[PDB]
A paper describes a structure:
Aconitase superfamily members catalyze the homologous isomerization of specific substrates by sequential dehydration and hydration and contain a [4Fe-4S] cluster. However, monomeric and heterodimeric types of function unknown aconitase X (AcnX) have recently been characterized as a cis-3-hydroxy-L-proline dehydratase (AcnXType-I) and mevalonate 5-phosphate dehydratase (AcnXType-II), respectively. We herein elucidated the crystal structures of AcnXType-I from Agrobacterium tumefaciens (AtAcnX) and AcnXType-II from Thermococcus kodakarensis (TkAcnX) without a ligand and in complex with substrates. AtAcnX and TkAcnX contained the [2Fe-2S] and [3Fe-4S] clusters, respectively, conforming to UV and EPR spectroscopy analyses.
The Fo–Fc omit map unambiguously showed that glycerol (derived from a cryoprotectant) binds to the active site and forms hydrogen bonds with the side chains of Glu292 and Lys530. Among the active sites, the side chain of Trp35 was rotated at an angle of ~136°. This conformational change may have a critical effect in catalysis, similar to the alanine mutant; the S449C/C510V mutant was completely inactive. Glu292 (but not Cys449) directly ligated to the Fe1 atom, whereas Cys273 and Cys508 ligated to the Fe2 atom similar to the wild-type enzyme, by which the [2Fe-2S] cluster was closely rotated to Glu292 by an angle of ~27°. The “complete” lack of the fourth ligand position left a vacant coordination site for the Fe1 atom, which differed from the apo-form of the wild-type enzyme.
Author numbering: 12 to 569
The structure:
């Protein structure tokens, strides 16, 4: 079978892979080249080709990256998946709805996906897809068999303005390709497209704001690409900082709260269990479903604003209880003597083992991970998987849900962990930067960082930078944690995250960095061009003191 998701026609090289790719962090919008150093397609330029991959993974920001690639002509000619997909499909949907450029997206059956992937040339139209001259019928897009309340139809008819109508059109089209049957109310939103990942990110926000866009539910804002109050004094180039600040300005104007944080679940406004929200940012989505028991799909950038403007989201995916049941079982080895570095590594490896469905992690309940531990795990899980949630037996409030009767069992062994640890430590021992706070550090994290520092001060050659939300930095000033960190030579930066940081705030002298973030360990090398080392919090501080990160497997892997 061949299903048309978004109509259109294309032709070019078959660029095929069996592993999902995040377009934000994995594809350079300036060149169209794969920059994920851990992906098989690394170094390949995707422009003009027909990309064959099972689905997407990682960042909600891939929609803005694809939209920019479409606007500059550097995009692939088309996208072929073999499973459900939202992020790239939404990006191509925004391109057709608001920007003229039709990129075709087709979902295949698995075996015709494997057959067509080993091909050399592929062509598409509204009718057919050819793999060297093996024409196959493409079934038309799925009919929207959706409920629309009277207020839904009224918004869709333009009774709340053109911006609200354009939001509803995108939501209804996304609901149609997701096979939904209705929309669902959301109580709050979290906008992720406020990162300046590409010029198109700003173009979309200004176009929605100039059409009258305003959010209907309380909506927070994710990390942005400037220290909003200080980027001019920091020497950030005007060519970058001005549109980056204007992008954040556009969403504040549309009524979003200027929280500028990728850990909104740490704010006083965090949702509770059973609450239906509309969140983007993959780590926050995963944390909201996994840890808090709230409900939100992993909404791509741009769709988050649409949901916030309407207060409505497609009733599909993990909004429904049946779709929250574990879809695969993962038996994780529990070695003795685990520290904080265990949890991001497990999340990273769990996503590689379960990249396309919801896992239940077994064998870890007695370990009692902190909220920060689960925070690091969910963030790392997001980088290697597409799923919006996971379960941890004996840790997360919904882990008792009956696994689906299709659920298979896989393992994460000690050998799996040693390979992953080495995978994330492809760098030297000399480091000039310690990167903490991806996602944004909690107050407990900043206090734990100061406790490990024990009043010492960093090596002069090693910068130590912590990214956190403004509200955490405000609280760290009250209880004295901030001054203690600055006593040790640590810089605490608001608004920015390591995903969005750039020179010169990212010190240009840096050749290698160490981080305690599994997420940034994966994305860091391609985003920064530097070598990246991964370790525990104390491994980071020791690197900060000595200038050096000892190349070694951890205590619990020896
Ligand atoms: S912006 Fe995604 S984790 Fe900080
Ligand atoms: Na991600």
């Amino acid at each position: 079978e061949a299903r048309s998701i978004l109509a259109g026609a294309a032709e070019g090289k078959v660029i095929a892979t069996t592993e999902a790719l995040s377009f934000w962090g994995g594809v350079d919008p300036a060149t169209g080249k794969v920059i994920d150093v851990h992906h098989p397609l690394h170094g390949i330029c995707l422009t003009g080709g027909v990309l064959f991959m099972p689905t997407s993974r990682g960042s909600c920001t891939g929609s803005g990256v694809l939209l920019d690639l479409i606007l500059t002509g550097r995009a692939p000619s088309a996208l072929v998946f073999c499973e459900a997909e939202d992020v790239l499909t939404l990006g191509a949907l925004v391109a057709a709805e608001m920007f003229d450029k039709a990129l075709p997206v087709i979902r295949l059956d698995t075996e015709t996906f494997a057959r067509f992937s080993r091909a050399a040339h592929v062509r598409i139209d509204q009718n057919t897809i050819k793999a060297d001259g093996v024409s196959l019928a493409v079934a038309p897009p799925a009919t929207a068999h959706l409920d629309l309340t009277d207020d839904d139809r009224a918004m869709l008819e333009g009774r709340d303005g053109i911006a609200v109508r354009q939001a509803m059109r995108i939501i209804v089209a996304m609901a149609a390709q997701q096979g939904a049957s209705a929309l669902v109310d959301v109580t709050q939103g979290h906008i992720d497209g406020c990162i300046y990942a590409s010029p198109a990110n700003l173009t979309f926000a200004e176009k929605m704001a100039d059409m009258g866009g305003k959010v209907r539910v309380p909506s927070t804002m994710n990390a942005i690409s400037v220290d909003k109050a200080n980027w001019r004094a920091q020497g950030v180039p005007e060519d970058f900082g001005d549109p980056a600040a204007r992008l954040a300005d556009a969403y504040v104007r549309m009524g979003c709260r200027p929280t500028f944080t990728c850990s909104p679940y740490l704010l006083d406004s965090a949702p509770s269990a059973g609450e239906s929200i509309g969140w983007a940012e993959s780590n926050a989505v995963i944390f909201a479903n996994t840890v808090l028991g709230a409900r939100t799909a992993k909404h791509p950038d741009f769709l988050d604003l649409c949901i916030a403007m309407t207060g409505r989201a497609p009733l599909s995916g993990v909004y429904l209880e049946e779709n929250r049941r574990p879809q695969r079982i993962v038996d994780v080895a529990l070695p003795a003597g685990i520290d904080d570095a265990f949890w991001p590594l497990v999340g990273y490896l769990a996503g590689k083992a379960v990249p396309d469905c919801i896992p239940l992690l077994r064998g870890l309940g007695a370990a009692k991970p902190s909220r920060d531990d689960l925070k690091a795990l969910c963030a790392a899980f997001g980088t290697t998987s597409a799923s919006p949630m996971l379960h941890i037996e004996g840790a997360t409030p919904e882990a008792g849900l009956a696994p689906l009767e299709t659920a298979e069992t896989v393992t994460i062994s000690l050998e799996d962990m040693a390979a992953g640890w080495s995978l994330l430590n492809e760098g030297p021992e000399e480091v000039q930067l310690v990167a903490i706070g991806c996602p944004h550090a909690s107050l407990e994290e900043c206090r734990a960082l100061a406790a490990v520092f024990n009043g010492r001060k960093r090596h002069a050659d090693v910068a130590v930078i912590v990214t956190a939300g403004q509200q955490v930095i405000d609280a760290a000033g009250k209880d004295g944690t901030l001054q203690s960190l600055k006593d040790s030579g640590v810089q605490v930066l608001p608004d920015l995250c390591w995903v969005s940081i750039s020179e010169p705030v990212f010190p240009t002298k840096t050749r290698a960095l160490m981080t305690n973030s599994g997420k940034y360990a994966h994305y860091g090398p391609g985003l920064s061009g530097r070598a990246v080392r991964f370790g525990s919090l104390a491994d980071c501080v020791e690197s900060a003191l000595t200038g050096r990160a000892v190349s070694r497997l951890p205590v619990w892997l020896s």
